[model samples]
Target: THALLIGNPNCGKTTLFNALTNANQRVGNWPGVTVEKKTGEFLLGEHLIEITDLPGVYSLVSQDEQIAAQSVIDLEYDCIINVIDACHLERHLYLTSQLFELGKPVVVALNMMDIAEHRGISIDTEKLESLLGCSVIPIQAHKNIGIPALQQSLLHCSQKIKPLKLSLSVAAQQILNDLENQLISKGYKNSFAYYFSRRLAEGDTLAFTESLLIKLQETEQNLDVLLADARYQKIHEIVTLVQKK
Candidate 1:
């Protein structure tokens, strides 16, 4: 069994990695990229699970972090340990929302709780979990708090995780729904239709729609900008509903 620890840069990914493994694991750049990738191991009850600490990423929808961590995310893993700074919850969630689009079961490591509280920010982990559709672990990793609980929850629920997709506009939804049926008929499994459709709208070359691709290629108008705006808009809406000052 294995888990990947990912988070925004300087958001304590390495610190959490060290604390979780209790070993001074060596850290270095990824094989071909300048970004650093850290690795370690920990025991979950009787099962020894390997932990790979991926490069810290800020945004997936509009930034290169998504590009940097793409391959790492595609690799096999039991669960994703998405570390987020509680003090910067709203900003950090952009990446969180994008991560969900990848269809992986994510366990959010809500770090910096103490800092958040000191800064007059309080997070309702349970409420946030409900809205975000993922497990939340309140941890101050360097201090060793909440690690055991996180491990327990992950071991019990990791296998049953799925990515959460935001509800799109009716127009987008209807188009996506139609495309989803087309995909299913073509042997695609039940997956999040939002990304599949949004990627199609953005005219992704390898998108699920060959017809949409050809239509987009023949057009002078680009829809990627419009699709990206809708995505960021929804992300902010969810952030407003969850994180409070």
Candidate 2:
């Protein structure tokens, strides 16, 4: 099975990836230093696990259009390993919340826990796990403290045991519900229909299916303007409040 490692820049994700996989991975700029996807492998017990490292960004809602562009694509993995710098928990939680909205099984690798402790920042992993509704593994990845447990978590994911699911905040849930209602009204009912509808509202390219394009030809909805206004306004408001101490 495959796992995708996603995190913000300078979170020690590359170091942990190398330690876990024992592969000599190289780092270079993407064509434009935008969405870089790195791949590596490791032997876990009898299973050969494939790992993909995604570009580090502040949030999946990246200022880099390439990163944000790639996020809308459907890339299914066995699981997602989110590496977070423990020192900046609130900032990192922004991306964590966005990933949860994607409706994918996720495991948060809380790297730099040691640094957090050094700085007298106490993170309640249990609280975080409960909030995210995903497995939270605190680790000093640089010192290799939690690699085995992480491997075991990956094994469990590969075996198709109960997959992780995230619980969205009330406001986020409201937006998701609203998006779904809008899609249903439009006569488009498919898997991820709501998310697709919302993305289309935000001018995402993938939202323009042939049918959607046909609908656009007849409609006068200024989807681009509507989406830009709604997405930024909502995201900024929600994230700012959520991060407040």
Candidate 3:
């Protein structure tokens, strides 16, 4: 099983990585850049689970670190373990919201639960899992809390994952699907096409996006703004429903 560890900066991502791999890991720099690359492998029953720790990123935009993270995300992987800061879920979830669009199995490692509790914050993990349509495991990497549950979730990563679609306007959904189909026709894989189509709709310029823009020149709405609005709307609703202080 191949998996990627991704999350925002200072989210205890490396601590989780260290807990999972123990002493069986390697560190190196990414080619053509000074960014560090870490990879490790461990035996889970008879299967060998390999994990790559990606550079921290807030979004998949074109910054150097973001590009490095996005390119690695574009590569092959069976699942994604997204480490989220429980205390700042709303901010961290902006990225998690995007990860759901990639159409891959995702296991959320909800770190810093102990700290969140100390600060009078509480979260419903099962509610979060249900709302997000993925497994959500609470963990404190430093103290080794909930790591076994994470490992159990990883064991099922190779199974089929239900696709999670964000609620958007009917017109916007149609446009997104159209863009996805266009990307697929150009030889892009289904998962990448779905993600790229969203990016394309969000005003990322490319030949296909440009051609798409030409056809919709008469439309009045800004897809980019609408997409961002829809994502935040969902995040707000989820946080309201599952988090308490």
Candidate 4:
């Protein structure tokens, strides 16, 4: 059984990953990470859970090729542990929204809840769980709160539970479609195309291969200009709506 631990940068995701597997992990490259994916055996009760520490990313619709690459892979994992920064609920929720669309069993580790509380950010875990359509457990890994609960939740993950259905608005959808068409026209590989579509829409320079960059230059499409257009505005609007809800 494997678990993919994912989240944004500086969200304490890597810290938790280190805690769970502790020196038993091996690092190797995924199509995304310049460094290899970190894999290791973690003993949860009697079962040895294989854990993959994926690259930290802000959203599933990321522009970074390395980050986007992980989004479309067909790897099987027993569960996906999404470590989120409790203090930044709005931004963190964007990633969760995309993960929910992937039809995977996800466990939201509401990490740094203590920090959130200290900052007067009160979160209703139950409400959040209901909203995301997944199990949400508050945790402060540094102090070891809720670790056992997380472990138990991981063990109990089942496909019977429905994933959250997150959808983009009409305008955002149009931009995504346009990006997809652009990738297909360039004859990019399947998974790469899907990954690139999202990244290009987000204006991620790293997503562009050297050849693709040359092609774009020939076509006179300024990557920055494209990202600054109406499409990005629509993406921001959609994300803002989801966050405010």
Which candidate's TM-score is highest? 3
Could you arrange the candidates by TM-score from highest to lowest? 3, 1, 2, 4
Per-residue lDDT of 219 in model 1: 51
Stretches of model 4 off by over 4 angstroms after superposition: 28-36, 61-68, 71-74, 160-245
Better of 2 and 4 by TM-score: 2
Give each model's whole-structure lDDT. 0.71, 0.64, 0.82, 0.67
Ranking by lDDT: 3, 1, 4, 2
Q: Give a tens-digit lDDT track for model 4, residues 9-114.
A: 8898877887777799877676554666677877887888898777777755433425444543556776788898988876776666555545557888989978
**Cand. 3 TM to true fold:** 0.88
lDDT digits (tens) for residues 24-68 of candidate 2: 455554446544556788888789888877767764433443454
Ten-residue region with minimum lDDT total, candidate 4: 160-169
Question: Which predicted model would earn the best lDDT?
Answer: 3
Q: What is the lDDT of residue 172 in candidate 2?
A: 45
lDDT of 3: 0.82
| Residue pairs in clash, model 3 | none
Candidate 2, position 171, lDDT: 52
Scored against the true structure, residue 226 in model 2 reaches a CA lDDT of 48
Point out the worst 10-residue segment of candidate 3 by lDDT: 60-69
RMSD of each: 3.8, 6.2, 2.5, 5.9
